């Protein structure tokens, strides 16, 4: 979370850099422990017939968060990606924090962030609903419609192409605000009932299964590493289905 040793960071899109710093700052003083990814993955790169893909993975856990994954990536010289998920411990019933930012030479093309539900009714907990409403409706000029698998995302999900610096900063601040709410809610949460824990586990399984339908991510991985590698990475590293 000291992103000071990151080889990628100095070379990434400025909005990505600010988000990475914001996420690292959110996590820095938590009761962190390492979370070992499959094969204790950290840095990885690959190429097949086209551009090289370079990826840095950082991953932690706390008693409330099963797995806190920050991924940074670059395809060739110019396509930059930040991926982050905080997977909740089902025992505590917290939503899933996620964000995905994709940028090229033309600027940021996609910025997505959410606190996604795990309840069977597909609603966020009452406390989240309240705190999120209090932020107000952000104005963004270029909204994007989620794909069908994106039914997993809350009504507060952002999915935009930022139109200018003001919007980039507004999006980053909204992600900061989501993280602030999420970290606070995490400390007022108690272990839930076995039936409730099971419900929340299912919500997290479903989230991962749906995220795996994102062909935009899959194609980037496949072009650099191939089908089998990409399937392993999506299903075991990015969106692992708990059980
Ligand atoms: C290896 C990691 C990684 C790669 C390579 C990656 C690539 C990536 N994700 C994308 C979109 C996207 N990404 C998501 C969302 C998410 N994606 C998430 O990983 C999470 C946690 C969310 C949501 C919280 C959505 C909704 C789209 C748009 C998909 C579409 O347009 O069909 C796009 C298309 C960008 C655009 O259309 O402008 C690419 C290239 N994303 C990645 O995370
Ligand atoms: Na390299």
Curated annotation (Swiss-Prot):
<dbReference type="GO" id="GO:0050897">
    <property type="term" value="F:cobalt ion binding"/>
</dbReference>
<keyword id="KW-0560">Oxidoreductase</keyword>
<dbReference type="Pfam" id="PF05996">
    <property type="entry name" value="Fe_bilin_red"/>
</dbReference>
<dbReference type="InterPro" id="IPR009249">
    <property type="entry name" value="Ferredoxin-dep_bilin_Rdtase"/>
</dbReference>
<dbReference type="GO" id="GO:0050620">
    <property type="term" value="F:phycocyanobilin:ferredoxin oxidoreductase activity"/>
</dbReference>
<dbReference type="InterPro" id="IPR022870">
    <property type="entry name" value="Ferredoxin_bilin_OxRdtase"/>
</dbReference>
<dbReference type="GO" id="GO:0010024">
    <property type="term" value="P:phytochromobilin biosynthetic process"/>
</dbReference>
<protein>
    <recommendedName>
        <fullName>Phycocyanobilin:ferredoxin oxidoreductase</fullName>
        <ecNumber>1.3.7.5</ecNumber>
    </recommendedName>
</protein>
<comment type="similarity">
    <text>Belongs to the HY2 family.</text>
</comment>
<comment type="function">
    <text>Catalyzes the four-electron reduction of biliverdin IX-alpha (2-electron reduction at both the A and D rings); the reaction proceeds via an isolatable 2-electron intermediate, 181,182-dihydrobiliverdin.</text>
</comment>
């Amino acid at each position: 979370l000291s992103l000071t040793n990151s080889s990628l960071m100095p070379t990434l899109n400025p909005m990505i850099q600010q988000l990475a710093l914001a996420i690292a700052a959110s996590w820095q003083s938590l009761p962190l422990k390492p979370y070992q990814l499959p094969e204790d993955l950290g840095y990885v790169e690959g190429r097949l017939e086209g551009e090289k893909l370079v990826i840095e993975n950082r991953c932690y856990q706390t008693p409330q968060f099963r797995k806190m994954h920050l991924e940074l990536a670059k395809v060739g010289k110019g396509l930059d990606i930040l991926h982050c998920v905080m997977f909740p411990e089902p025992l505590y019933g917290l939503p899933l924090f996620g964000c995905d930012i994709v940028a090229g030479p033309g600027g940021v093309s996609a910025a997505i962030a959410d606190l996604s539900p795990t309840q069977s009714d597909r609603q966020l907990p009452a406390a989240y609903q309240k705190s999120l409403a209090e932020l107000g409706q952000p104005e963004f000029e270029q909204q994007r419609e989620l794909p069908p698998w994106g039914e997993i995302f809350s009504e507060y999900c952002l999915f935009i192409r930022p139109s200018n610096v003001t919007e980039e900063e507004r999006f980053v601040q909204r992600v900061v605000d989501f993280l602030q709410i999420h970290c606070h809610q995490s400390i007022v949460a108690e272990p839930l009932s076995e039936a409730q824990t099971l419900e929340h586990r299912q919500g997290q399984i479903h989230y991962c299964q749906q995220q795996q339908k994102n062909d935009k991510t899959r194609r980037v991985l496949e072009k650099a590493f191939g089908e089998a590698w990409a399937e392993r990475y999506m299903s075991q590293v990015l969106f692992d289905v708990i059980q």
